[PDB]
A paper describes a structure:
Coat protein 1 (COPI) coated vesicles function in retrograde trafficking between the Golgi apparatus and the Endoplasmic Reticulum (ER), and between the Golgi cisternae in both retrograde and anterograde directions. Coatomer (the COPI complex) is a heteroheptameric protein complex, consisting of α, β, β’, γ, δ, ε and ζ subunits. Arf1-GTP recruits the protein complex coatomer from the cytoplasm and anchors it at the membrane. Polymerization of coatomer at the membrane assembles the COPI coat, which recruits cargo molecules and membrane machinery to the assembly site.
Numbering used by the authors:
A (entry chain A): 703 to 813
B (entry chain C): 605 to 843
Write the structure that this text describes.
């Protein structure tokens, strides 16, 4: 259903749902909320699952917020030292600008 | 004193004693004696000469090694390499978690290739999307027989495949006759497609967009570029 909601070009319903299944635990699923979005709040939770400031940085940096991820990372006694490619490079783009719909509701006919 | 003896011990001996050494907790030293690929390997896990462990791996000769190792590498946060091993493993799932977290297209192409590999429909889609590629998502659907669903995407974010696709879906339906089951129209009648005139296509927004895809949305960030995708987005998008 969530998928239907993201298919369609509108934003909330998925988010409450996201709340209500985030709230029902998770280790690989948060992902669903993030892409079609920019911003995620999941990160507040996420760090707790990870909490190695690593995820928090990778995620963090672009809202102009790499920084908190570093603060903890330091506090720990950091453990990061090498990284692989991953520089945001894939397009979270597509959906439905004016003319030629969405489909909340879909019309048809027996004919 | 022992060292003089040491020449005068070989293969297997080294192993036993190595275990003793290991018991001594003279792991490094235990490493020096080290004498079985397994033996070396486990110790290596404990030990973490990372590169060194790789050489022992050499050609690992078991993804299981890589899997085990991957967890370890990741712990050491020796990712550049980890990626190489994991990639070498091509063990997609864990590897995805990293790759995604910083984000990356390149990973995505190779992966796309992978995506094709995996054998359940769903992941591959996220990828296609993730990349931004309706086209890919839709092509994927063609193989799986996702047909109702494919239509929704084709509609929402318009590649107007809704017209193309709908005919085919309908055809299936058609096969399974009954007029209601057949179901029919694209520009006008049942559907009024382009005559409805509403929210998944056009040039101007699109032009702005054309660029948009190219820059980073911005708010304040890192070398790891911007795109956003929230309230603002909705507003311009309408424009």
């Amino acid at each position: 259903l969530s998928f239907l909601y993201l298919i369609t070009g509108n934003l909330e319903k998925l988010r409450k749902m996201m709340k209500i299944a985030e709230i029902r635990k998770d280790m690989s699923g948060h992902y669903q909320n993030a892409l079609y979005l920019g911003d995620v709040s999941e990160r507040v939770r996420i760090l707790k699952n990870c909490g190695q400031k690593s995820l928090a940085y990778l995620s963090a940096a672009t809202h102009g917020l790499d920084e908190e991820a570093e603060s903890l990372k330091e506090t720990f006694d950091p453990e990061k030292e090498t990284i692989p490619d991953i520089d945001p490079n894939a397009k979270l783009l597509q959906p439905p600008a004016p003319i030629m719909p969405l489909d909340t509701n879909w019309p048809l006919l027996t004919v | 004193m022992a060292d003089k003896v040491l020449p005068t011990i070989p293969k297997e001996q080294r192993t036993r004693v190595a275990h003793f050494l290991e018991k001594q907790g003279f792991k490094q030293q235990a490493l020096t004696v080290s004498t079985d690929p397994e033996h070396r390997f486990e110790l290596a896990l404990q030990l973490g000469e990372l590169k060194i462990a790789y050489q022992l791996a050499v050609e690992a000769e078991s993804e299981q090694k890589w899997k085990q190792l991957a967890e370890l590498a990741i712990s050491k946060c020796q990712f550049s390499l980890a990626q190489e091993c994991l990639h070498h493993a091509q063990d997609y799932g864990g590897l995805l978690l990293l790759a995604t977290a910083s984000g990356n297209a390149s990973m995505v192409n190779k992966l796309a290739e992978g995506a094709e590999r995996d054998g359940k429909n769903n992941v591959a889609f996220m990828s296609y999307f993730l990349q931004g590629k309706l086209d890919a998502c839709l092509e994927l659907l063609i193989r799986t027989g996702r047909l109702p669903e494919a239509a929704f995407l084709a509609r929402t974010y318009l590649p107007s495949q809704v017209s193309r696709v709908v005919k085919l879906w309908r055809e299936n339906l058609s096969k399974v006759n009954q007029k209601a089951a057949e179901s029919l129209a694209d520009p006008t009648e049942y559907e009024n497609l382009f005559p409805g005139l509403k929210e998944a296509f056009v040039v101007e927004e699109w032009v702005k967009e054309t660029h948009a895809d190219l820059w980073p949305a911005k708010q304040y960030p890192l070398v790891t570029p911007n795109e956003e995708r929230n309230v603002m987005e909705e507003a311009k998008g309408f424009q």
